[PDB]
From a paper:
Of particular interest in this regard is the putative centriolar [name]–[name] complex, as mutations in both components result in MCPH. Instead, we demonstrate that the TCP domain of [name] constitutes a novel proline-rich-motif (PRM) recognition-domain that specifically binds to a short target motif in [name]. These data strongly suggest that the interaction between [name] and [name] is a conserved, essential step in centriole biogenesis.
To understand how [name] and [name] interact at the molecular level, we obtained the crystal structures of the TCP-domain of [name] CPAP937–1124, both on its own and in a complex with [name] STIL408–428. In both structures, the TCP domain adopts a nearly identical conformation, suggesting that no significant conformational change occurs in [name] upon binding to [name] (RMSD = 1.5 Å ± 0.2 Å over 148 ± 4 Cα pairs). The TCP domain folds into a single layer β-sheet comprising ∼20 consecutive antiparallel strands connected by type I β-turns and is stabilised by an extensive hydrogen-bonding network. The resulting sheet shows a twist of approximately 13° (i.e., the angle between the consecutive, hydrogen-bonded strands), slightly lower than the average value of 20° observed for typical β-sheets. Individual β-hairpins correspond to previously noted repeats in the TCP domain sequence; the turns of these hairpins are often constituted by a PDG motif explaining the high frequency of proline and glycine residues in this domain. Crystal packing interactions involve only small protein interfaces, suggesting that the protein is biologically active as a monomer. Indeed both small-angle X-ray scattering (SAXS) and size-exclusion chromatography—multi angle light scattering (SEC-MALS) experiments demonstrate that the TCP domain is predominantly monomeric in solution. The structure of the TCP domain represents an unusual, novel architecture. The TCP domain structure lacks a defined hydrophobic core typical for globular domains, and both sides of its β-sheet are exposed to the solvent and well hydrated. However, what, to our knowledge, makes the TCP domain structure unique amongst naturally occurring proteins is that it solely consists of a freestanding meander β-sheet that entirely lacks a defined hydrophobic core and is not flanked by other globular domains that pack against it.
Residue numbers in the entry: 955 to 1124
Write the structure that this text describes.
């Protein structure tokens, strides 16, 4: 079949019967497949939008970025530089850089960086903290004080000039 609507939109079945092809008057194009997958091209935005039956949506942008919308509410963005950012329903954003570094932006204002080496940096308004696989924690406060927590339970606190003001262990 070919149907041409009064507004000039055309609905045409592919010759082999499998693809329903709508050519909208505004330049948009929609193909609907036998599995009910819908592929929609938006002409002005030059964007492709695929809707799967299970509700997943994938958008492909002309800058080469991809955005995938999961049934669990996550949205995963693949930038043109290959960075993959995941937006979680609770507001966390987690970027995985190509070298595998993970950068997490959290709703509370913090930024957490998980390096390949196992080290983890936590940045808040009040401190910058580094965590190490053995359990060591070094924290530098906005006022310049520095705390080292050792794997043993020992906690050593220094003033901003480096003088020890607290050194405790159970």
């Amino acid at each position: 079949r070919l149907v041409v609507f009064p507004n000039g939109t055309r609905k045409e079945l592919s010759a082999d019967g499998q693809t329903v092809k709508v050519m909208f008057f505004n330049g948009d194009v929609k193909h609907t497949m036998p599995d009910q997958r819908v592929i929609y091209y938006y002409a002005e935005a030059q964007t492709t939008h695929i809707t799967y039956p299970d509700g997943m949506e994938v958008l492909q942008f002309p800058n080469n970025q991809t955005e995938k919308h999961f049934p669990d509410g996550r949205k995963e963005i693949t930038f043109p530089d290959q960075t993959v950012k995941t937006l979680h329903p609770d507001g966390r954003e987690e970027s995985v850089l190509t070298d595998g570094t993970i950068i997490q932006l959290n709703p509370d204002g913090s930024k957490v960086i998980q390096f390949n080496t196992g080290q983890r940096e936590i940045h808040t308004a009040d401190f910058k903290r580094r965590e190490y696989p053995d359990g060591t924690v070094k924290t530098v406060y906005s006022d310049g004080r520095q705390e080292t927590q050792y794997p043993t339970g020992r906690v050593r606190l220094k003033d901003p000039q480096g003088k020890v003001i607290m050194d405790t262990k159970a």
